[PDB]
Design a protein around this nucleic acid. Structure first.
Ligand SMILES: [K+]
Ligand SMILES: [K+]
Ligand SMILES: [K+]
Ligand SMILES: [K+]
Ligand SMILES: [K+]
Ligand SMILES: [K+]
Ligand SMILES: [K+]
Ligand SMILES: [K+]
Ligand SMILES: [K+]
Ligand SMILES: [K+]
Ligand SMILES: [K+]
Ligand SMILES: [K+]
Ligand SMILES: [K+]
Ligand SMILES: [K+]
Ligand SMILES: [K+]
Ligand SMILES: [K+]
Ligand SMILES: [K+]
Ligand SMILES: [K+]
Ligand SMILES: [K+]
Ligand SMILES: [K+]
Ligand SMILES: [K+]
Ligand SMILES: [Mg+2]
Ligand SMILES: [Mg+2]
Ligand SMILES: [Mg+2]
Ligand SMILES: [Mg+2]
Ligand SMILES: [Mg+2]
Ligand SMILES: [Mg+2]
Ligand SMILES: [Mg+2]
Ligand SMILES: [Mg+2]
Ligand SMILES: [Mg+2]
Ligand SMILES: [Mg+2]
Ligand SMILES: [Mg+2]
Ligand SMILES: [Mg+2]
Ligand SMILES: [Mg+2]
Ligand SMILES: [Mg+2]
Ligand SMILES: [Mg+2]
Ligand SMILES: [Mg+2]
Ligand SMILES: [Mg+2]
Ligand SMILES: [Mg+2]
Ligand SMILES: [Mg+2]
Ligand SMILES: [Mg+2]
Ligand SMILES: [Mg+2]
Ligand SMILES: [Mg+2]
Ligand SMILES: [Mg+2]
Ligand SMILES: [Mg+2]
Ligand SMILES: [Mg+2]
Ligand SMILES: [Mg+2]
Ligand SMILES: [Mg+2]
Ligand SMILES: [Mg+2]
Ligand SMILES: [Mg+2]
Ligand SMILES: [Mg+2]
Ligand SMILES: [Mg+2]
Ligand SMILES: [Mg+2]
Ligand SMILES: [Mg+2]
Ligand SMILES: [Mg+2]
Ligand SMILES: [Mg+2]
Ligand SMILES: [Mg+2]
Ligand SMILES: [Mg+2]
Ligand SMILES: [Mg+2]
Ligand SMILES: [Mg+2]
Ligand SMILES: [Mg+2]
Ligand SMILES: [Mg+2]
Ligand SMILES: [Mg+2]
Ligand SMILES: [Mg+2]
Ligand SMILES: [Mg+2]
Ligand SMILES: [Mg+2]
Ligand SMILES: [Mg+2]
Ligand SMILES: [Mg+2]
Ligand SMILES: [Mg+2]
Ligand SMILES: [Mg+2]
Ligand SMILES: [Mg+2]
Ligand SMILES: [Mg+2]
Ligand SMILES: [Mg+2]
Lengths: 118, 50, 126, 145, 134, 206
RNA sequence: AUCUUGGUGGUAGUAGCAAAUAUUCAAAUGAGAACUUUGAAGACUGAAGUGGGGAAAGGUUCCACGUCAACAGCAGUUGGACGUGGGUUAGUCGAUCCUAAGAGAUGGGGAAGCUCCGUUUCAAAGGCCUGAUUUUAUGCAGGCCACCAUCGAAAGGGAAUC
RNA sequence: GCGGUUCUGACGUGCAAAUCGAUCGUCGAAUUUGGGUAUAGGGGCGAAAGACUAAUCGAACCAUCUAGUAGCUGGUUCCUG
RNA sequence: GGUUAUAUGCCGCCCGUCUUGAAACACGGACCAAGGAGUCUAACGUCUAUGCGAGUGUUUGGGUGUAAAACCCAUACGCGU
RNA sequence: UUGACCUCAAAUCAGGUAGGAGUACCCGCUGAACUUAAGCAUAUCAAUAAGCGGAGGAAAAGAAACCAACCGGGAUUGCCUUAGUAACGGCGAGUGAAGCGGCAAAAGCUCAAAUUUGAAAUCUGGUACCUUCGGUGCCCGAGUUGUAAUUUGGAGAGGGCAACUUUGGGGCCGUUCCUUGUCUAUGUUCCUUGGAACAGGACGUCAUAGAGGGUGAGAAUCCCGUGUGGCGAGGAGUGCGGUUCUUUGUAAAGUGCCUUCGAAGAGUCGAGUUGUUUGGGAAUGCAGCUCUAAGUGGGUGGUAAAUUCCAUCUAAAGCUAAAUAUUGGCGAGAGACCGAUAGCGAACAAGUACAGUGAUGGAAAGAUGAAAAGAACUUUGAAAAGAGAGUGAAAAAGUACGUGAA
RNA sequence: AAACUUUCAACAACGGAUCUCUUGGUUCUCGCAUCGAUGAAGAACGCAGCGAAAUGCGAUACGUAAUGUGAAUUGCAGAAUUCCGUGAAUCAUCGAAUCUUUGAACGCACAUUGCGCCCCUUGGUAUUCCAGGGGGCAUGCCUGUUUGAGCGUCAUUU
């Protein structure tokens, strides 16, 4: 059938590591059997289980690190948002919104007015 | 060429694996138009140029 | 006549969109009309065909034959009914490919999702 | 290459002119876009008109000084005479131009008249609330010909 | 001057183009200065430059640069224009003061060739415009 | 612009017992040595490649367009011409055929079709239905698959339904009387379109 | 258009398939044997070989089993062909290390610039020894010397196998 | 081994886009040669023939400018009046 | 009587091309299919048709639209007077 | 001796940043020749190709050291005009702009030069905390060789007098804008032909839907869509319409009169000369070298010079949407376009196979049938195959597959 | 007379024209603005029950996670038909990951699968040797930190 990642997300770090090894053992066993038999398609299910478990392990370990840098200025580049190189170099909303005191005063004194012709 | 680089040997290994006729079951596939292996190479016909 | 600037009347584009339709899109392309019996019951003209729907053939050489949809061969844009078959000279029996627009569904294979679809189209269910 | 009694011609096609031919097939398309953009702008700016009020000026040169036409903007002097500051006027739909000078009482008086007629025929909404439904007139140029 | 960099003074063409000596680069020594500095400090933006000195062999300039990554510049409303990426390598495109001089970007009858961009102007004047209704 | 010239072909010159056309260089493929560039070569450039700056649209003096439109309108009121142009107006009583202004406010196709049959446009509608044919030639590949006759032109003064109600009837055009179109009044440059005027449109003509 | 691409003739069953001394008998195999295999015979290369190994180059051609449509300018049961597999084992043999003619970063200087020069220079150009301390394998304790990256040989130099 | 004199031999739709046979020059050095390395196109290299520089040389090869220009050669497609 | 094949009488050089002169001992053509060469554009001359006429030209643009169409239009500008 | 300062270094020091790609359009640099002139050198091709550097969704330009000479206009760009004109030119071939006028789009502004001097009022970083595109404390640092506030020539500043006017910043809910999902008519009724009805005939139905496509032949009505309208989901953004919280004000801005002032960019401008370039002609711009200013000054006013006026701007510092470009990228819609020797080189495992040491060069090649129903079985043959039989509407459709010319 | 040669027809060849077709091209219009040191474009080598390609992907390898759909995929094999469901699929979508060796390409090199050094850790009697696992070490430039250099230079104190 295969493992299901919603079931794995309940599990602990150690339980998952243990399961990962049981799958790696199982996969080896089938690689041997494949030599004898003509066709052996069960091996696909266990390849994908391994890949599932590693995905979940990595998710857990990353979310742990996201918590460790909660709120801190500077976090690992791999947890920073990707966007694009050019977007990451752009001025922030704050920087782009800055006006000098001279211009702030003019903007208050003389905003564009709403008006209509009759 | 007895004493050869790994890089050359790796390319030769690739060439070994590709040197085969088309698997017959491809011909049975729905809407198949591949008749034969059109990129087959032979040591007597065409050189690999490394 | 079309009015929307998003829709195309280009033949070439239409044919491309059909022949390269992915499996999901082909589901909708392979709809069949309900029988006039079932049209009363559910209040729906047509549905996407499904394995284990029962069917009547209403056009072609096998017009009149009935059976269950044994397979929806979306890749071939066709359905295979069990019992509609070709007796081959060697004695083997291959399925005939029928297009769902030439069938009529006489019994639906229902389930939570099919039921939800029927009520979604303003059907009745009972 | 010269023969018969024909005009001498001056067809300048000795450069690689076919690299730079612009056929205006987008004429109809550019007109639909321009119109959509007027509509879009009108909606963003509503109820304001799409144009600023502009002064009358005399065209220069002996060939066209018999005509008057719309100029760039009111003078600082005309805006002051109409009972208005440049900074305010800019915000109430009046084009102001610091470069143009008044040396002619007829054009000056006519421009001051324009500004008075304009301040009569607009309604400036207060910068808070209450805002009464005015209805958008798109052209100051058609209102104040 | 800029000596034409051709082997042994051979030019391989018509006599008008046989010059090698007495030719002159179309940008100023000031612009060369900004450009070479600009390449040494590619994280910075060249703002402007000025003459300080000369001998027979060299002219000396000082080039003012701004760091667009420094938060003192990014948060300054008067200077953060230079952070926008249109202003990358302004010295290389002729957009500094010395650049605009050498490109002939000025108003009036003396700058008809150049005021809008020499190449743009040329292209506009050598375009055949055909309407649908000719 | 690049078709036919994506080749480094050069003439071999005389002395090789071949024609002096440019030839593809190199070796090891069927294309090597073959004729190139010229209009007579397989794979070469067409003679005088078509260019986009051919004159496409044509200017016509406005006052001449108006003349033709007025002639076209005048001919709509001559039953001889309307018959000759293939309209089935044998059993209509009177051309010009004017009908009530009520036509302008019909909302449903079913109703608008009944009105056209009522006033004697049945045969001309039928003609359009029976005339659908697949187009001869490569036009079929180019989004012009079917062909059929033109039906009546219904002319109104104000559209309060009628354009949408006639949109789907094969061959029926509609038109505001303010903006009459020579391409509808004289299809194929043949005078005598069958026109059904509303009373309001007919008064507006003056 | 000695036109372009493709196809097809006559020529014609014609020119021809004649260098390197050379083949023969029997059996086996097989639908079929001048040509495959075995045996018998006759000859040749004649050790500056048609023998036994390698370098460059090739890249699986090596070996087995199956096997003949095409290819081996006759043939073919045979094959460097076709199909399917098997096969290359290192502390000691090479590479790897060293420098050669040379190539080439850096410091610098040229050049609008792609880049060019130059190779230890008009540079603040490093990295070892020993004890400890027992805090530790980093600062500390001492000392010591300072030349100038790097690449460049499967025939040069070179740790070690029969 | 390196060369290439004569037969003006073979061949001359070849075994071969330079070969074959015989005859011949030289054969311990201004010798022959492998590999590494340097020199690049108005450039190199040359015991010098305008030789050689990948079957290309009194200026290589590749692409582009380029559909270069041609007072010159060839061609230029249905009928009747 | 037509058609067609053949026979008989008389007649009939191979086309294309350049050329004063080609059947030429002038050139291209072994054969067959398919492709294959005065085009489009800017500005013009004469002539003709058409509209309006001391004027004329709606289409840069604006308005409108059943939306690259059709329909409507101010100020200029061009040519003319 | 101890501690500064200045200048210069080092570190796998803390945190960042550049490079390469694409390259249609855009900003520069560099820069040909073929070609034309019936020869050819100046000229032309061309301020083009090739080469190099640098950007963006646009770029650049841009709020006059402008145009003018008028009754004056008023940033830039683009279109129509100006105009094949003024002018340049072996005054040959050829080349060739600008002002005004009509339009599209429209938007304006910032520094330097000033004593906060009764208060460096300013800012990076680290650190703790928080409501985190950031905020608040605290601490080092930068900075007086000058960071803030104030002013930019249209002005404006300092004093003095007199008056009235106008304001900030949050959430929350609609609309907007984009990206998506889903629901929303009517015959598979009869006859004929056919392998198949989607054909013909008959009788209907829907139509704001008779666009288009599919299905065994020309299908509005068999299927998907189309038309109309409804209902969801996810963002983005205050653009602006409502509501709610906090009211910034001893603050900020605007305005009249009097008075004293009014800082305004140098190896620049300008000049000579050299080269290049321009329609720019005793010199249009650019650049090298030499010379090198002024402050009622300086520039321009398309014939050099002196003298006298006048007119017009305010250089040598800076930012800025839109109208404009676009053989590239992404997403769409179309065509009197081509229809497999055509159209992109490429309808196909095509920039592939293949050639070349390399740069590079670079093909051919689409169609059985509705459906494989792709010929069981028999027989001759070593076999390939034949002959039958069969499948199919047809093998005069057998994969050497539509038609099947010469 | 036959053969032979030639001409025409029928049937059969050869060959692939013609006709009909078209998920391709071409041109015009409209809208949009998004590559890269957070490792791009491009390259190499790999990966499927049975593939040589094309296409997809990276030792988690024709994919993993998430979301939507609601039962396939299909050449065969196999699996599954609690499929009235946290659920089929070469499905759509896509926000989380994985992403060999490379490449601007960054420890030094590269016709080498060549040779280093540093930190943490495990094993072998181990600070120093050998091995395994993890994580690091390019250049220019900016701001800052720290450690310094120079009779450049001030004060102070010998
Ligand atoms: K040259
Ligand atoms: K010259
Ligand atoms: K070419
Ligand atoms: K070894
Ligand atoms: K060695
Ligand atoms: K030379
Ligand atoms: K070569
Ligand atoms: K040359
Ligand atoms: K001549
Ligand atoms: K006869
Ligand atoms: K001739
Ligand atoms: K001759
Ligand atoms: K760095
Ligand atoms: K010249
Ligand atoms: K000019
Ligand atoms: K000059
Ligand atoms: K003025
Ligand atoms: K003056
Ligand atoms: K081709
Ligand atoms: K057939
Ligand atoms: K198309
Ligand atoms: Mg190659
Ligand atoms: Mg072509
Ligand atoms: Mg013979
Ligand atoms: Mg012979
Ligand atoms: Mg023999
Ligand atoms: Mg012998
Ligand atoms: Mg012997
Ligand atoms: Mg063997
Ligand atoms: Mg043979
Ligand atoms: Mg044989
Ligand atoms: Mg083999
Ligand atoms: Mg050894
Ligand atoms: Mg070097
Ligand atoms: Mg080495
Ligand atoms: Mg050795
Ligand atoms: Mg010889
Ligand atoms: Mg001889
Ligand atoms: Mg002979
Ligand atoms: Mg000689
Ligand atoms: Mg030609
Ligand atoms: Mg030529
Ligand atoms: Mg007779
Ligand atoms: Mg005779
Ligand atoms: Mg003669
Ligand atoms: Mg003749
Ligand atoms: Mg003769
Ligand atoms: Mg001749
Ligand atoms: Mg001949
Ligand atoms: Mg020929
Ligand atoms: Mg033809
Ligand atoms: Mg660091
Ligand atoms: Mg030319
Ligand atoms: Mg000439
Ligand atoms: Mg000539
Ligand atoms: Mg000449
Ligand atoms: Mg270029
Ligand atoms: Mg970009
Ligand atoms: Mg824009
Ligand atoms: Mg800009
Ligand atoms: Mg100003
Ligand atoms: Mg202006
Ligand atoms: Mg004129
Ligand atoms: Mg010129
Ligand atoms: Mg103030
Ligand atoms: Mg059909
Ligand atoms: Mg130049
Ligand atoms: Mg700017
Ligand atoms: Mg083609
Ligand atoms: Mg048939
Ligand atoms: Mg056939
Ligand atoms: Mg024949
Ligand atoms: Mg990677």
């Amino acid at each position: 059938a295969g493992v299901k990642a919603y079931e794995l997300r309940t599990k602990s770090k150690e339980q998952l590591a243990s399961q990962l090894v049981d799958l790696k053992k199982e996969l080896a066993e089938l690689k041997v059997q494949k030599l004898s038999r003509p066709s052996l398609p069960k091996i696909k299910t266990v390849r994908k289980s391994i890949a599932c478990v590693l995905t979940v392990i990595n998710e857990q370990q990353r979310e742990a690190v996201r918590q460790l840098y909660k709120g801190k200025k500077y976090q690992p580049k791999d947890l920073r948002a990707k966007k694009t190189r050019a977007l990451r170099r752009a001025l922030t909303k704050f920087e782009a919104s800055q006006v000098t005191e001279k211009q702030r005063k003019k903007q208050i004194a003389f905003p564009q007015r709403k008006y209509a012709i009759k | 060429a007895a004493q050869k680089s790994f890089r050359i040997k790796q390319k030769m290994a690739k060439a070994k694996k590709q040197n085969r006729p088309l698997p017959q079951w491809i011909r049975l596939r729905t809407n198949n138009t591949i008749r034969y292996n059109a990129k087959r190479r032979n040591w007597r016909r065409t050189k690999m140029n490394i | 006549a079309k009015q929307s600037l998003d829709v195309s009347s280009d033949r070439r584009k239409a044919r491309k969109a059909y022949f390269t339709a992915p499996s999901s899109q082909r589901r909708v392309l392979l709809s069949a009309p309900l029988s006039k019996e079932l049209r009363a019951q559910y209040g729906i003209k047509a549905l996407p065909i499904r394995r284990d729907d029962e069917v009547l053939v209403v056009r072609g050489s096998k017009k009149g034959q009935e059976g269950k949809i044994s397979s929806v061969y979306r890749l071939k844009f066709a359905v295979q009914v069990d019992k509609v078959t070709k007796e081959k000279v060697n004695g083997a029996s291959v399925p005939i490919n029928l297009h769902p627009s030439k069938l009529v569904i006489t019994k639906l294979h229902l389930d939570k999702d099919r039921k939800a679809l029927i009520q979604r189209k303003g059907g009745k269910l009972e | 290459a010269i023969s018969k009694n024909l005009p001498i011609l001056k067809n300048h096609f000795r450069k690689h002119w076919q690299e730079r031919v612009k056929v205006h097939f987008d004429q109809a398309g550019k007109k639909v876009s321009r119109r959509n953009a007027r509509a879009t702008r009108a909606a963003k700016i509503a109820p304001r008109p799409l144009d600023l009020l502009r002064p009358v000026v005399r065209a220069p040169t002996v060939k066209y000084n018999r005509k008057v036409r719309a100029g760039r903007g009111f003078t600082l002097a005309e805006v002051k005479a109409a009972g208005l500051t440049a900074a305010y006027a800019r915000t109430i739909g009046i084009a102001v131009d610091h470069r143009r000078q008044n040396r002619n009482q007829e054009i000056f008086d006519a421009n001051v008249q324009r500004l008075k007629e304009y301040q009569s025929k607009i309604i400036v909404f207060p910068r808070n609330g209450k805002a009464p439904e005015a209805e958008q007139v798109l052209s100051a140029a058609a209102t104040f010909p | 001057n800029r000596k034409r960099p051709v082997p042994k003074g051979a030019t391989y063409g018509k006599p008008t183009n046989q010059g090698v000596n007495e030719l002159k680069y179309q940008r100023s020594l000031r612009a060369t200065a900004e450009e070479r500095v600009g390449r040494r400090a590619a994280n910075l933006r060249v703002l402007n430059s000025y003459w300080v000195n000369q001998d027979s062999t060299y002219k000396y300039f000082e080039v003012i640069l701004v760091d667009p990554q420094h938060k003192a510049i990014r948060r300054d409303a008067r200077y953060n224009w230079i952070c926008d990426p249109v202003h990358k390598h302004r010295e290389a495109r002729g957009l500094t003061a010395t650049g605009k001089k050498s490109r002939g970007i000025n108003k009036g009858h003396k700058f008809n060739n150049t005021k809008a961009g020499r190449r743009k102007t040329w292209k506009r004047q050598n375009t055949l415009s055909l309407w649908r209704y000719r | 612009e690049k078709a036919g010239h994506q080749t480094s072909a050069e003439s071999w010159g005389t002395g090789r017992a071949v024609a002096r056309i440019p030839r593809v260089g190199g070796g090891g493929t069927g294309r090597s040595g073959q004729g190139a560039f010229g209009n007579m070569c397989r794979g070469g450039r067409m003679f005088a490649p078509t260019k986009t700056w051919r004159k496409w649209n044509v200017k016509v003096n406005h006052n001449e367009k108006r003349y033709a439109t007025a002639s076209a309108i005048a001919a709509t009121a001559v039953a001889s011409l309307v018959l000759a142009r293939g309209h089935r107006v044998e059993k209509i009583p009177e051309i010009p055929l004017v009908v009530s202004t009520d036509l302008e406010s019909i909302q449903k196709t079913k109703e608008a079709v009944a009105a056209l049959k009522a006033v004697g446009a049945h045969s001309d509608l039928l003609k359009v239905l029976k005339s659908k044919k697949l187009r001869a030639g490569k036009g079929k590949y180019r989004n012009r698959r079917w062909t059929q006759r033109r039906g009546p032109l219904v002319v109104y003064a104000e559209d309060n339904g009628i354009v949408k109600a006639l949109r789907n009837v094969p061959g029926v055009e509609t038109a505001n009387v303010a903006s009459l179109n020579l391409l509808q009044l004289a299809p194929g440059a043949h005078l005598g379109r069958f026109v059904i005027w509303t009373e309001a449109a007919f008064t507006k003509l003056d």
